[PDB]
Amino acid sequence: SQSIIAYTMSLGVENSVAYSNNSIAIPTNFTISVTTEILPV
Amino acid sequence: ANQFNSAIGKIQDSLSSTASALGKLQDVVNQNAQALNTLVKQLSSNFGAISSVLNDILSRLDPPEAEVQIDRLITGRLQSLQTYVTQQLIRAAEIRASANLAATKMSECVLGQSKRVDFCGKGYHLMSFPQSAPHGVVFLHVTYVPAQEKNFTTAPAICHDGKAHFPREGVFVSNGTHWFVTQRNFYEPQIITTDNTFVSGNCDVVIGIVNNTVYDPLQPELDSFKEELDKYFKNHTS
Amino acid sequence: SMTKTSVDCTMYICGDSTECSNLLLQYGSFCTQLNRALTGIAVEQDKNTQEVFAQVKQIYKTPPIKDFGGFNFSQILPDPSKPSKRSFIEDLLFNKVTDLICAQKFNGLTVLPPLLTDEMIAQYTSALLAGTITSGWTFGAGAALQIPFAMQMAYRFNGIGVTQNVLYENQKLIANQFNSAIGKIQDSLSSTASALGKLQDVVNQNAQALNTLVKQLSSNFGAISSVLNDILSRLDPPEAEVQIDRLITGRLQSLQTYVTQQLIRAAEIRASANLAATKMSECVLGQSKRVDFCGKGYHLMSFPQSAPHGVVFLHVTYV
Amino acid sequence: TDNTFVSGNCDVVIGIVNNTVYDPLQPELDSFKEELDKYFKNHTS
């Protein structure tokens, strides 16, 4: 029971970052990410 | 150690399971395959002549009639060959532009360390590992990305003796009790000291300055001497 | 990006002709190579919009209570009260860049609509603007870190060699210098309409190429008449195949000439798109110390703006 | 001394000029020495 559907392009998840004068955010942790790029020569 | 080794294992799993990540190189093979096939298939076209076979035109029509029909065949083929060469010159400009970008990332990301954003990949660049690829090259980029974050209370300066104390390295953070100094890239709370800050201007020229006590590491050590030296001076009089 | 065009080989060379359609079979795949070349251009036009306009997949918004420390961003930020989402500067950027479309579509020249609408372009711009304002340099290299904008200028000055003490003391002076400089941008773009001429040359290049491609049809190319119905109604079918072939060869070279010029202009627009994609990441998201890249002087911040068939960068430097 | 650092000598550097480098510990300790002189006179008094 599946078919082709049409829809408007989504622009991505909307996330409103809080903003204040006396407020700040500092990372408490981190991570090591590895990415792959393929460039023809 | 467990973050990098597991990440390389993800690269091995993503490369083995997904074979379409190299499609950028497969497009090069496809563009050449379509170009080599198109050039040879145009030889069977009549190009406005009676027949595409040159042996049939020469062995049938008269020399005055054959030179006309073969002329349409040769001219039509030259236009197809010039079209092939023109398309190869266009793909040549595209492959040389990608080669200059590969030579740039090889130098900055691999040989050295580049601070450019979205050049060596998402995040703060650390190291890049090149890998051999057919008709191309593969770059393995290791980057530094933050994970967990927490909201803190900040302030542009600390007011102690009446002059603003600006942080030497890092920013001011507090949990609502005592003000701490930590770097922007990671959270390592430290006590505010004269070595971690520097005195510039006064407390009035700073907008939003807060009052606190800057710890002087020489204050308790010098006061301990005033206690000891007076105990010595008291023994000098006895 | 450039105007996406799709030209049919049949209707451009000889339309509504069955006898000529059989004469085209003798020239082989010429339609396939000319159609895939024009199709590949239209695909690359949408790839330039994904690599430049939208840098990140996360949409950032502006908080309702605005205290920026004395800077006025109302001109660079979009106005929600307007029916179409745009800023005060983008209002001029769209108006200063200029039916010929329907007239060319009658001869077989199809104008393909772009995948990325201008309204979605303004959202990617507003997402990068609201992110640079609130998140500073953090959203580009990872998760967005909340930082007050007053402390963001302190780090941007420390990067060019300026101690942050200059910021807190000159905070009122810098507030007047920035707000007055942004006001000069709207006044310069309103009075001078030739500042966008780099984009107008792209529209003029497509207009001259499409119009000249149609003007080639009026030429007889050494034949008796350029009209197909004339040759069929005048010369016998055996004699008509000679005159029609004269129109085929000429219009084929005229169509291959247009495709060749568009493939050359496609390489120039992708080179400018890669430069725009580089400045979008280094100047806007982060802070680049490169000279004469993010603009003359010591770079501080960069504000992207939406423009027809392009993008406008607002660079703030320390002079 | 906190804004500068010691490298080489005055003879090697070409164009060096003579001046006094203010050490913030000198007046704090010299005044601390004067207090000790006042403290020692207080124990004798």
Numbering used by the authors:
A (entry chain D): 689 to 729
B (entry chain D): 924 to 1161
C (entry chain B): 730 to 827, 848 to 1068
D (entry chain B): 1117 to 1161
Quote from the publication.
Overall, the pattern of these structures is similar to that observed in the Kappa S-ACE2 complex. In the S-ACE2-C2a, -C2b, and -C3 maps for both the Beta and the Kappa variants, the up RBD-2 or RBD-3 appear also to associate with ACE2 if we lower the map rendering threshold, indicating a dynamic on/off of ACE2 association with these RBDs, in line with our BLI data showing relatively rapid disassociation kinetics between ACE2 and the S trimers (koff = 1.00 × 10−2 s−1/9.34 × 10−3 s−1 for the Beta and Kappa S trimer, respectively). Similar to Kappa variant, ACE2 binding to Beta S also induces a pronounced S-trimer population shift, facilitating the transformation of the S-ACE2 complex to the more open C2a/C2b (64.0%) or fully open C3 (27.7%) states, beneficial for the shedding of S1 and subsequent transformation toward the postfusion state. In contrast, for Kappa and Beta S-ACE2 complexes, they all present pronounced population shift, i.e., with only 14.1% or 8.3% population in the one RBD-up C1 state while the remaining dominant population existing in the more RBM exposed C2a/C2b and C3 states with two or three RBDs up and possibly engaged with more ACE2s. Transformation to the fusion-prone C2a/C2b and C3 states can lead to loss of concealment for the S2 central helixes, which was offered by the RBDs resting above them, and decrease in S1/S2 interaction, facilitating the shedding of S1 and transformation to the postfusion state.
It forms homotrimers protruding from the virus surface and, once engaged with the host-cell receptor–human ACE2, undergoes a substantial structural rearrangement to fuse the viral membrane with the host-cell membrane. A large number of SARS-CoV-2 neutralizing monoclonal antibodies bind S protein, especially its receptor-binding domain (RBD), providing a basis for vaccine development.
